[PDB]
Amino acid sequence: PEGLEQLQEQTKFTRKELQVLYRGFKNECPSGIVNEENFKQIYSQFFPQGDSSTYATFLFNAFDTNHDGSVSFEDFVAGLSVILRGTVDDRLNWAFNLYDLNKDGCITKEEMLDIMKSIYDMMGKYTYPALREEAPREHVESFFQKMDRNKDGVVTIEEFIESCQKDENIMRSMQLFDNVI
Amino acid sequence: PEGLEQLQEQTKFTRKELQVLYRGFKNECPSGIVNEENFKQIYSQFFPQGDSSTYATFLFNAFDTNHDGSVSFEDFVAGLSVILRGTVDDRLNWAFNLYDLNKDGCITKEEMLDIMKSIYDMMGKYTYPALREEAPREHVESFFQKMDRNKDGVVTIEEFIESCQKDENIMRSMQLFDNVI
Amino acid sequence: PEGLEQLQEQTKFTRKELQVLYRGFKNECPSGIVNEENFKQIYSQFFPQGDSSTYATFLFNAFDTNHDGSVSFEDFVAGLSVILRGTVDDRLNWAFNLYDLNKDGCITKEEMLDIMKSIYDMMGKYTYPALREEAPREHVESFFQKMDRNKDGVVTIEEFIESCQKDENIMRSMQLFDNVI
Amino acid sequence: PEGLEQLQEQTKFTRKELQVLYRGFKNECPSGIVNEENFKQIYSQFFPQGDSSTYATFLFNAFDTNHDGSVSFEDFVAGLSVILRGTVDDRLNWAFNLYDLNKDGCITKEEMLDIMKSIYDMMGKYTYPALREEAPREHVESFFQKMDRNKDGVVTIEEFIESCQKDENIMRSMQLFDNVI
Amino acid sequence: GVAAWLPFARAAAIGWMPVASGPMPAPPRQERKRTQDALIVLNVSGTRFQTWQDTLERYPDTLLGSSERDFFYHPETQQYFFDRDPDIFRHILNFYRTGKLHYPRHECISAYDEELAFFGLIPEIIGDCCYEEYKDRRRENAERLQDDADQKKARLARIRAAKSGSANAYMQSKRNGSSFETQHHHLLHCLEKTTNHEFVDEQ
Amino acid sequence: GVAAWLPFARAAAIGWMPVASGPMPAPPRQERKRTQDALIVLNVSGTRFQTWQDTLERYPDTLLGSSERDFFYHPETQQYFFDRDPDIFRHILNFYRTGKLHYPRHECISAYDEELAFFGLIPEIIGDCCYEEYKDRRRENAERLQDDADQKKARLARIRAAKSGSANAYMQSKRNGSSFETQHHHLLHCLEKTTNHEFVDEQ
Amino acid sequence: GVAAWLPFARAAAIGWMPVASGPMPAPPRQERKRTQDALIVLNVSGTRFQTWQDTLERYPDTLLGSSERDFFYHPETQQYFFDRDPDIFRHILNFYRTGKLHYPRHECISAYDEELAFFGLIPEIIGDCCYEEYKDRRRENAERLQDDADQKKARLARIRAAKSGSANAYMQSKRNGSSFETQHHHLLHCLEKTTNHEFVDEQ
Amino acid sequence: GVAAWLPFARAAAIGWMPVASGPMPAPPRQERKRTQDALIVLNVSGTRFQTWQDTLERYPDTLLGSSERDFFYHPETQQYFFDRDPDIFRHILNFYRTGKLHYPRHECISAYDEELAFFGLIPEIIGDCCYEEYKDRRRENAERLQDDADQKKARLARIRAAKSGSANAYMQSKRNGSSFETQHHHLLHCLEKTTNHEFVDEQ
Ligand SMILES: [Ca+2]
Ligand SMILES: [Ca+2]
Ligand SMILES: [Ca+2]
Ligand SMILES: [Ca+2]
Ligand SMILES: [Ca+2]
Ligand SMILES: [Ca+2]
Ligand SMILES: [Ca+2]
Ligand SMILES: [Ca+2]
Ligand SMILES: [Ca+2]
Ligand SMILES: [Ca+2]
Ligand SMILES: [Ca+2]
Ligand SMILES: [Ca+2]
Ligand SMILES: [Zn+2]
Ligand SMILES: [Zn+2]
Ligand SMILES: [Zn+2]
Ligand SMILES: [Zn+2]
């Protein structure tokens, strides 16, 4: 278990912020580590009208860097520091790694299909327009035709980045939400 | 449940007075509301030589304005503010509404008979002069011949008021008791 | 139960002294009063080599002025104030009343025999000189030939007093022990 | 049980040091005294790779001066004051008395053999060079050929002392370890 | 419910953020000094309990989680005071910290239920670890209450003796011619003057 | 008993007020600063209990509700100190707050009864929730006491050994030639001088 | 483990000191003000516990014995604060003082195990005095949990009602157009904007 | 034992005073400021207990009644500190206040006996109200201890694993080349230098 001083010098959180984060983390996980199932149970209760299990699995794999099957407080604050306190490029790299399931270095259409299926599973089966059973497919199509630039059937980190900086709404979303907290 | 600030701006009690009233109310009614039976049980133990159940029913109906069958702390302090802190006309209106059982706008002789029966039930069955079984009837007669002015067999709010201001003893009773506390 | 202020104005003890006395009295007698048997049980454990039961009975009768069969804190501090804080004549009157069993106004030889039997019962059955079984008798004789002056076979309060002031050792004993505490 | 002030005036420890020592002693021995078996149980857990029982017996006999079969806090701090706070000659006398099992005034080769057997029992049965089963014998030989000066087959307190002051390493060991704590 | 992992969920939204097609809403101001490091004091009958304010905010609709708490605040001492039982309040507070309510077997079920009702806790939130114990104890106490409803006479004699003593105390006050007693006797005298009748001694 | 709803009853008298025929009595002065916001401290063996003064005034004829309480006040610290058991005092105080007395099953019945007697509480005020439990425990402890009245010899030997030790301590004090011990030995020496006899060692 | 007799063992080394053949190592500096007379304060939910720092250092690999404790230190008040149960913390602290863990029979086994897990104590360190009691209670609670795994439907209905209430609260917030509720609703609105779909009321 | 009625006995001596034939001894000086209004503080693991000094002086030959208490005094804070269990200390203090010792049924008998031994209380002073309970519990715990003497192997494996871990920790310290650990490793290195032998890793 990394100490408070080492976490202070590694992450971008202050001593008070790390203490509050540890307080909450241990209040939910008294053992100091969380497995995938307890992680899903924690994450689900923010989405009372959908199924967040698949997206929670993606998050757990992304956060648990050393692939121990357990997210420790170190994994927790490392990921939270990269997302909440990192630069826009750091967040974009984190999101790209989330999408790239095999971590090979590219995003295929089926990889993005898994991600959008996980995201739409939170919308629930009883939504306003329809449960079209194809909205993730065409959303993947839109994401590719926006992100991909050489039209090679895949998304690379360069195209992901440059397409992201070419979208003002993405900038607004990055600066506002992940910096207010 | 109305907050402390809203009750402060609605009633005429201070923050300390409302806090003391809430403390006592919740000490007797932990749920924060009181039904007719618990209300009777509370009110009876101030009258250890009589039966206050009928007068307690009248009080419960008068205090419970929204006719929910329950007196909340809001009902409680609204009534207490009208009686203890209101003007003499406010208290007189409250008493007239207590007497007018059907709330139609007039007091009949049978309505007053019910009220005096309830009041004399507190005197108990073992009193000094006698349990004449007719004292409420002649007390209603005296009340009508004092209050009623057009002798129509009924009491209206105008006659009630003006007859009340024409009785110095009623003024002494209003100013002293309902303002000392 | 007499209050602290009334006991302050009745006895000669201060508020602190009365509080300490009440603390001890209630520590031994939580009910606030003591009967003859509990009184004996309390008094005996100051005399681990004798039998103090008879002298304890005499003390209980002397302290319990209203003859309720119970010594209250009022009896307790009244007696303690007369003995510890009263004048030499007050103490002498208290002792004379202790000796005069029937409270008639005189001390006979058999009354004094009962007192000296009670006192010698504390000495125990295993003492230095002997358990002569007649020492109380001759001690009564000495007490009478010292106290009695008209040789009428009885001791009156006048002879008791004047003979007491004519004994310097009695003065030393009165001033020292009952004033140090 | 000797008081804190008497132990202060007897030993060379301050009030704070004696209080800390008593705190620890009573934390291990709530009764305030320790027998040989509990003493062994306490001492063993500093040597997790050997058997300290024989050396612990020697220590218990040396510390328990009055031969009550029990080491009290007085025995404890008396020995600790002689060792930790005494002069080099005081420590040397204490060690010589530890070696002289019969306390006659001399150290024989078999007495030293018992001591070195006890010391080597802490080394354990699984050590680096070997469990030669004769190392204590030749260590006794070396100790005698260093300490004994008249070669009489025995060690006296004079030879022990003078040989000790003639060894600089022994001085370094005495001054450093038994004075830092 | 779980506000500790809310920043984690807000951060996890970063996986949604790039794939969204369209704008995003305005983030909340959240300008309340982060509502952190409060450590409010709940004084229950002289026993100090300390807790984070957000811990209490985890469960609104209860006394401690709502603005009803304000009725018990003492600005002079900067603490909330409750004239309640502190031992049961320990379990009340543990509920906020964990989300589950435990039932102490050594306490009276009536006292426990009264403390639950006072603080707005519903007995159905008792965890399965303690629910069978609580249900059994509540069943015994319901059985006692029903057996009484359908040795009570000692209680009835005691309450009648209490009313007789109150009436006699008022009569002795009248004969002579304790703030509560004085105001209550004034109310009884007002009742006398209302009915023009006077009470008399029962014996 | 219930002083919290007394202002409610006084207000409810307004229904009597107009129909009365004749004058009304003089209302009480009640000039005691409303006896509110006191929050007195009861220090029981170092444990601080806090309560409203009117809560204690609800039940006179008990120690805490009467002027007997004044015997335990410490003006220097502005608190009442009781050298009693605080855990049982919790139930003592709960009685004032609710009117009912609960019996803790985990405490000795003798200790509980001694604390009840000290504070002037009668065991018949125990609520029906706890009365059967209390009665059963009191029955077992009465059975033990009666079985003793009609293994005691260990107690008898211990008390005789204690008296022998006290006598021997006084004899050793005499041989030598702890304020309590000194005053007690002075009293025993005074008894010796009174009877002109001296004690001797039993062995 | 036992640091109190460590000076005794270091002194006892004096029997080794003369018979050694060869030099001796360098003694440790130990320049930390002897780490004595600390008396640190552990504030558990408002209850002050005090202990020597070396007592806690006796057992590293636990929360209180390790640097993990630093996560709970409050430099402003110079104390450690724990939002945990103080009654169970008494046994937690007793473990450090004695080395053995006792199990209180009157507490819920689940609460006890959660407090053990929080503070890093392993249930196998419970002393033999309490181990059979603890094992039996844990067996009953495992039996309950397994019987559930293989009256639950009340829990399931309650949790579904809670999710429906949360969804309805978000819908009512949308209709209107509590910091936690505001941030959570913002997150849900962000999810809506991500999927270009909106929620609708279930009824 | 009972110093509260000692002034009463000294006053009662006035019945002896006149009938004595001969002089009287010199009364004690008793110049110690009456040893009253002390109210000393016994801090047990952060829990404040307060008592009169004479209450503790009632029973010498125990820790609190003797000068042994001085070993636990903290002149800086003007209080006695004990690193013991406060819940059992409540009964310890109740013994001084009443003279009888009660046994709490909910506490472990081993912990209770250890606290009795620490404070110098003999189990034979337990009152008859609690003696049968205490004797039965002590009998069960003796039965367990004897059954062990004549599932232990888990304890034996744990202690052997602990010794192996300590030896491995010292070996790893040697390989690298926590004040207690440093001093203990220095002592082990001194033992090595004494015997001219070195330890080796068990695996
Ligand atoms: Ca990990
Ligand atoms: Ca890929
Ligand atoms: Ca591409
Ligand atoms: Ca209403
Ligand atoms: Ca009408
Ligand atoms: Ca009319
Ligand atoms: Ca009397
Ligand atoms: Ca006579
Ligand atoms: Ca004569
Ligand atoms: Ca010894
Ligand atoms: Ca020899
Ligand atoms: Ca030689
Ligand atoms: Zn539970
Ligand atoms: Zn109950
Ligand atoms: Zn145990
Ligand atoms: Zn008992």
Side-chain angles (χ1 to χ4, degrees), chain E residues 108 110-111, chain F residues 100-103 127 129-130:
Chain E
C108 169
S110 286
Chain F
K100 54 209 322 295
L101 198 51
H102 299 285
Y103 168 66
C129 45
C130 300

Side-chain angles (χ1 to χ4, degrees), chain D residues 99-116:
Chain D
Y99 304 150
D100 183 11
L101 303 191
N102 61 355
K103 305 267 154 306
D104 73 323
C106 75
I107 310 178
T108 71
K109 300 167 55 184
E110 59 266 54
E111 276 177 331
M112 210 54 231
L113 203 285
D114 286 47
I115 303 277
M116 314 263 210

Side-chain angles (χ1 to χ4, degrees), chain G residues 18-28 38-47:
Chain G
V19 317
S21 62
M24 285 277 159
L39 222 50
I40 79 171
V41 174
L42 310 168
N43 191 6
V44 182
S45 281
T47 296

Side-chain angles (χ1 to χ4, degrees), chain B residues 5-18:
Chain B
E5 281 290 326
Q6 304 124 59
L7 289 173
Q8 224 169 331
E9 71 97 10
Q10 288 178 4
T11 56
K12 294 169 189 179
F13 297 111
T14 71
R15 205 149 169 108
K16 246 80 155 74
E17 290 162 351
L18 283 174

Side-chain angles (χ1 to χ4, degrees), chain B residues 2-75:
Chain B
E2 282 290 315
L4 185 39
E5 281 290 326
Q6 304 124 59
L7 289 173
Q8 224 169 331
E9 71 97 10
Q10 288 178 4
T11 56
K12 294 169 189 179
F13 297 111
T14 71
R15 205 149 169 108
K16 246 80 155 74
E17 290 162 351
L18 283 174
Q19 281 176 331
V20 173
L21 285 163
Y22 197 77
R23 201 180 87 214
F25 192 85
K26 282 268 287 188
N27 187 260
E28 290 293 320
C29 319
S31 54
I33 54 96
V34 60
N35 61 29
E36 218 191 83
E37 319 103 88
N38 278 123
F39 180 92
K40 285 195 183 109
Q41 158 276 310
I42 294 162
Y43 189 70
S44 74
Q45 69 227 7
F46 289 105
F47 304 88
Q49 46 255 23
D51 178 286
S52 56
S53 277
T54 307
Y55 192 71
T57 303
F58 292 136
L59 295 176
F60 189 91
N61 301 329
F63 265 84
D64 178 73
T65 63
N66 57 312
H67 319 291
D68 41 313
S70 157
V71 163
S72 61
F73 186 66
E74 296 99 271
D75 312 283

